[PDB]
Design brief:
39 residues; mainly alpha; 72% helix; antimicrobial protein; Anti-microbial; Membrane bound; monomeric
Length: 39
């Protein structure tokens, strides 16, 4: 399956795009359990 090659690229690329966009998506979900200690 091409997933082998496609997975090798997206893996390293994902790290490049992350910072390119800002990298702050996972933190958005954390707010559901971070607002309690966001003082």
């Amino acid at each position: 399956g091409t997933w082998d090659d496609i997975g090798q690229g997206i893996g390293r690329v994902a790290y490049w795009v992350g910072k390119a966009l800002g990298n702050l998506s996972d933190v958005n979900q954390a707010s559901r359990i971070n607002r309690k200690k966001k003082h």
